Amino acid sequence: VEPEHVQRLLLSSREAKKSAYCPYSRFPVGAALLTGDGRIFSGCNIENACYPLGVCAERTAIQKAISEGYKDFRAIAISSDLQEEFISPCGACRQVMREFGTDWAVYMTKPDGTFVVRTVQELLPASFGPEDLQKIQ
Amino acid sequence: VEPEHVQRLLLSSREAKKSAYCPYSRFPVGAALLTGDGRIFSGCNIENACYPLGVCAERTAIQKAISEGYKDFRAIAISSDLQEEFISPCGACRQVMREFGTDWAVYMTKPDGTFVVRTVQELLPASFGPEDLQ
Amino acid sequence: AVEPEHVQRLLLSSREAKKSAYCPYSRFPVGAALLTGDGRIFSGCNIENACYPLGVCAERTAIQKAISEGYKDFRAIAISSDLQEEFISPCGACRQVMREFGTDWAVYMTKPDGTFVVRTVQELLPASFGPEDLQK
Amino acid sequence: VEPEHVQRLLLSSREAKKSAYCPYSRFPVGAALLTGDGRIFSGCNIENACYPLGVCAERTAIQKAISEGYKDFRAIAISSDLQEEFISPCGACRQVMREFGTDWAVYMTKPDGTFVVRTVQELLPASFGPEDLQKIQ
Ligand SMILES: O=C1C=CN([C@@H]2O[C@H](CO)[C@@H](O)[C@H]2O)C(=O)C1
Ligand SMILES: O=C1C=CN([C@@H]2O[C@H](CO)[C@@H](O)[C@H]2O)C(=O)C1
Ligand SMILES: O=C1C=CN([C@@H]2O[C@H](CO)[C@@H](O)[C@H]2O)C(=O)C1
Ligand SMILES: O=C1C=CN([C@@H]2O[C@H](CO)[C@@H](O)[C@H]2O)C(=O)C1
Ligand SMILES: [Zn+2]
Ligand SMILES: [Zn+2]
Ligand SMILES: [Zn+2]
Ligand SMILES: [Zn+2]
DSSP states (O other), rough: OOOOOHHHHHHHHHHHHHOOOOOOTTOOEEEEEEEEEEEEEEOOBBBBGGGGBBBOHHHHHHHHHTTTTTTEEEEEEEEOOOSOOOOOOOHHHHHOOOOTTTSSSSEEEOOSEEEEEHEEEEESSTTGGGGGGTTOO | OOOOHHHHHHHHHHHHHHGGGOTOOOOOEEEEEEEEEEEEEEEOOBBBBSSSGBBHHHHHHHHHHTTOOOOOEEEEEEEEOOSSSOOOOOOOHHHHHHHTOSSSSSEEEEEOEEEEEEEEHHHHHHOGGGGGGO | OOOOOHHHHHHHHHHHHGGGGEEEEEEOEEEEEEETTSEEEEEEEEEOOOSGGBBBOOOHHHHHHHHHHTTOOOEEEEEEOOOOSSSSOOOOOHHHHHHHTTTSSEEEETTTSSSEEEEHHHHTTTHHHHHHHOOO | OHHHHHHHHHHHHHGGGOBBBBBBOOOOOEEEETTTSSEEEEOOOOSSOOOGGGGHHHHHHHHHHHHHTOOOOOEEEEEEEEETTOOOHHHHHHHHHHOOOOOSSSEEOTTTSSEEEEEEESSSSSOOGGGGGGGOO
8 A cells, every 4th residue: 555665664663663772761662764775774762771861763773874874865764652643753863864864754653554754854944954064065 | 922021032142152162163052041930041052072962052041940940931042153044943952842832932043133933833843742651 | 178068068959959850751850069169059950851862960950050150160069869778870971071171070979868979070980081082 | 913803893993983974073983892692783973963963983883783682792892083092982872881781891992903991880980870760779
């Protein structure tokens, strides 16, 4: 029913959630990042005794990709155990997503397979970015 | 919000920028928060040798306000030295703002005094929030 | 060292600061108070977020408050929590922020009964990364 | 001459530095993490226009490992272009390392291959950790 790449995205994010390290919130989250060439990098939240030091599924996935040399992203899907709410990315992840482009898709899903799609631009209007430090020239 | 407050808020934000500790970016930023009862808490960005450990002006101000017992905010103004564009809050700050409501105002200014106003909701659509964990 | 008077003021201040803690997620309130060179005290408490990574520790709330007011000379900082049988220790992120402003100052890790362990920033963060590494 | 695992760590850390996304500080850092079963996970610092949203090499590597299901870490090496100074992990990274043990090694290096090794414990004494949050005490 859904395009093949969307199927891959949803399945990978749901699978990625199994590796979540969240003994404090018991709120497992998984993510699957799709690059331009078709490769997928997965991620999950990894908390810390000192809450502020944890990391979200999206950034774990984006950080993995970049460390591997991939900066061209097409889309990223997110999965959680919230059955009645589309899992949405926090502002911090939106900012990191934005560092690598505003024109890519974020699939906010539910366990049943349903989802909402918004671009990074829509998720982060009038975004602060590289231009602020006059880095685009 | 009362224009009397808006002005005091905008000035406080620029004044706060003078304390900025940003020897790495050399991009100082100030912010001023207005609570529901008219009290104003300001803040500035404080960087660190290891970049990830720095903090933004908005959060410095919000964190200050909360530590003083205030959690009901009406607006927050931001000021920087960037001439070409209105200084807007990074996603992390938008998420901290959201933690305490989506209906308040964010004043994104330019050094000359002009600005654009947007609510926390408009800056962080379809947000993740407290209700996700309740 | 630091006079028992300032230490008591720091101690009472951190404990009092802990009352404002915003921590509905962990329900682990923490308070902190730092002493500047001129004797002024600034306090803070942890402030969490629905998305855990966006919270902040009590020490950084205090330090950032101090700096925002123009103070960057610290003599000592005291931390307090509800942990009965354990001295509350600052996390690594806070130690690194403390280090940005010196390594020779004192950190007081306390218990709810007033007992404490004191260590310098240098001792809590040895062979540290710092501003000097970016100059060279 | 160093033990094979040390050579691998040193070399991987050096190679991972090439993927560093650090246009703001222009200070590239690489890290390599050795797990108990011998697998190595690399990472690099990934900055953001808004400085606070950046991530260090050590955590990029640790998060990669955990996302893949590895929590038993044996050692991690760090590399930078700092010629006459062993690159040291920031306090934030030492806290993340500590979440997964205090008794493993950290190799702080220089480009010439020389290094200083300390355990997580020595780099983060009287640390705050998971047990401080245990329900019963
Ligand atoms: O969309 C997202 C919302 C939240 N989280 C993670 O969920 C836990 C609770 O905030 C934390 O571990 C937090 O990082 C994500 O990883 C993604
Ligand atoms: O030494 C300290 C240890 C932890 N914390 C705070 O405690 C909660 C649980 O990690 C989080 O809110 C965390 O920030 C401090 O504020 C100080
Ligand atoms: O809206 C804002 C944009 C950026 N910053 C700060 O500016 C520096 C460059 O990213 C960093 O110190 C960053 O924290 C703020 O304080 C507020
Ligand atoms: O040991 C380390 C010290 C610093 N960093 C990174 O170097 C840049 C300067 O703070 C930042 O990008 C910072 O994250 C590392 O990744 C490792
Ligand atoms: Zn996030
Ligand atoms: Zn910010
Ligand atoms: Zn801390
Ligand atoms: Zn680090």
